[PDB]
């Protein structure tokens, strides 16, 4: 299909779950009941999000199975995906200050990673692939891996709520880390 | 019959025979006549064998791993002929109808002559993917869509009960048409000196008005009233009035100044005419724009821009120049989905963020 590496792995983990979730028998024998029996089993356990992907992936397999001429119908399009609500709390200004100070026992790169991730607002994935060669004449060329967007954050930014400066943060990484 | 088998047809296909002159002729199951085709043996038989793509004449079919479900019906190559008789009554513009015929023609030389409930989803995917491996992905999408609506109308006329084409997916294009910056603009306009004069005038006029190349060759000097430029797009049908007071500083081109240049040098009934004082086609304008592109020597990544790209460059310039809502009403475009998918860069220029 030609996709990202990590992406292909995510689907594989879903396929393996289907293996130990459904018996080994012809596709035309698999009923919609057994499909929902396994699906709901993951919804009650608390993992409602996983059920959505497994249901959306298992459906694609059958849709591609019909294309080959294996079966005639997709008994997965009769089910219904469980609506899951995000329960990952957000972070405030007071909380961040309480974590930065508690990161004392931690190495000397975590604090720098915190201020940097908040001053640049970039994703953790690209923050690790940032080289000092990316900085060009007061800029910060960042190549997002996820989407692929290309931007340039100037070394003049500064958060007026926590007391952090883009420039003072970068130079602090050149002295400590190196 | 009089002659069941022979020592001549013994090396010949069911159709096609051999006369007493060593010549071969292929019969016709519509009148009982035949035409002389071939002097050799392995040639007349190798010719009267692809029409022979349809011995239904005995033989049946079956691939590796599959089921069974059939009875009896009629051909299908003919349905592609009846489908064209239905599309001509749907009331379609004289340009879109041609776009469909070209696709139906590709379906003809793609799928084997076959009944309609015979062509399995696997057979349609083999032909579809064949165009993907060639790079033509945008084509497979239109061929699939057309071949999909053909069966839909077929089921509504008591012929088929399912739509096997709806089972297979459609390719997802990426649009590899590189954009055109303001710097590369002057590079082309400078090389447009070897080309006629109407090219440079229509090139700037296509960036100052941000109109389509099609409607650009439809504007007359009578469509200008009280300083306005009444333009009626043919594609959508939207009607707008462009003020003759516009101006692009990023390129140093005045609206009124450009208009007058087409009144003296060119001259004619249309704003943009030829050296013979006659209106040109929408395929010749963007044609010569290519010559100046290749003669330039500049290189891009993917597919070189086009004359239509001038419409895009016009929108991006008017954006920073005046406002965003300005580069929306001028392009004769509405909604709120393309206004953003026409401002992007698509791997060309970095989206620099400034303190503002």
């Amino acid at each position: 299909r030609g996709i990202k590496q990590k992406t292909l792995i995510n689907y594989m983990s879903k396929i393996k779950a289907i293996r130990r979730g459904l018996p080994d028998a012809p596709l035309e024998d698999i009923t919609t009941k057994e499909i929902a029996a396994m699906l709901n089993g993951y919804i009650d356990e608390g993992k409602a999000a996983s059920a959505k992907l497994i249901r959306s992936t298992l459906s694609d397999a059958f849709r591609e199975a019909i294309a080959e001429g294996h079966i005639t119908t997709n008994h997965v399009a009769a089910t219904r995906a469980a609506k899951s609500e995000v329960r990952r709390s957000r972070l405030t200004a007071d909380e961040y200050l309480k974590i930065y100070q508690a990161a004392e026992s931690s190495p000397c790169w975590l604090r720098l990673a915190m201020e940097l991730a908040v001053v640049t607002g970039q994703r953790v994935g690209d923050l690790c692939e940032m080289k000092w060669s990316d900085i060009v004449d007061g800029y910060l060329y960042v190549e997002q891996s996820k989407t692929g967007v290309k931007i340039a954050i100037p070394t003049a930014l500064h958060i007026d709520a926590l007391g952090i400066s883009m420039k003072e943060t970068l130079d602090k990484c050149k002295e400590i880390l190196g | 019959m009089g002659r069941r088998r022979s020592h001549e047809r013994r090396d010949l296909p069911p159709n096609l025979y051999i006369r007493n002159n060593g010549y071969y002729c292929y019969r016709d199951p519509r009148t009982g006549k035949e035409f002389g085709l071939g002097r050799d043996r392995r040639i007349a038989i190798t010719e009267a064998i692809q029409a022979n793509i349809e011995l239904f004449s005995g033989h049946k079919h079956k691939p590796l791993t599959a089921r069974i479900n059939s009875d009896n019906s009629v051909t299908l190559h003919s349905w592609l002929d009846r489908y064209e008789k239905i599309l001509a009554s749907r009331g379609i513009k004289q340009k879109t109808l041609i776009n469909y015929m070209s696709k139906i023609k590709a379906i003809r030389r793609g799928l084997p002559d076959a009944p309609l409930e015979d062509i399995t989803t696997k057979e349609i995917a083999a032909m579809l993917n064949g165009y993907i491996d060639e790079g033509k992905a945008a084509s497979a999408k239109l061929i699939r869509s057309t071949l999909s609506d053909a069966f839909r109308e077929a089921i509504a006329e008591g012929h088929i009960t399912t739509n096997h084409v709806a089972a297979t997916r459609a390719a997802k294009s990426e649009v590899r048409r590189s954009r055109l910056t303001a710097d590369e603009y002057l590079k082309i306009y400078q090389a447009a000196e070897s080309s006629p004069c109407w090219l440079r005038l229509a090139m700037e006029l296509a960036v100052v008005t941000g109109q389509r190349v099609g409607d650009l060759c439809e504007m007359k000097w009578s469509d200008i009233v009280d300083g306005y430029l009444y333009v009626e797009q043919s594609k959508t049908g939207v009607k707008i009035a462009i003020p003759t007071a516009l101006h692009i500083d990023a390129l140093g081109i005045s609206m009124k100044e450009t208009l007058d240049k087409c009144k003296e040098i060119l001259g004619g009934e249309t704003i943009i005419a030829s050296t013979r004082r006659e209106p040109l086609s929408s395929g010749t304008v963007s044609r010569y724009f290519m010559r100046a592109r290749k003669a330039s020597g500049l290189s891009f990544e993917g597919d070189p821009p086009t004359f239509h790209e001038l419409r895009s460059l016009s929108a991006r310039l008017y954006e920073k120049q005046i406002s965003d809502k300005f580069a929306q009403h001028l392009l004769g475009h509405k909604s709120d989905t393309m206004a953003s998918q026409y401002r992007d860069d698509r791997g060309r220029e970095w989206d620099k963020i400034e303190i503002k």
């Binding site: - | 013994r10 038989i45 190798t46």
Partner: protein, 54 residues
């Protein structure tokens, strides 16, 4: 996708002697013909037998 005379005979309902395989080609009993490429026929991925009679 094109295969050889040996690889083709391996993917049939019943593999016979190479001699018999060559005979069918000469007698033109396969759609479409193999077409000699140098000194070894090249069957088509869809080239199947037909068989005639009298």
């Amino acid at each position: 996708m094109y295969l050889t005379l040996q690889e083709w005979n391996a993917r049939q309902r019943r593999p016979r002697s190479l001699e018999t395989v060559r005979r069918w080609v000469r007698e033109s009993r396969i759609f479409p013909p193999p077409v000699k490429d140098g000194r070894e026929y090249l069957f088509h991925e869809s080239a199947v037998k037909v068989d005639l009679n009298r």
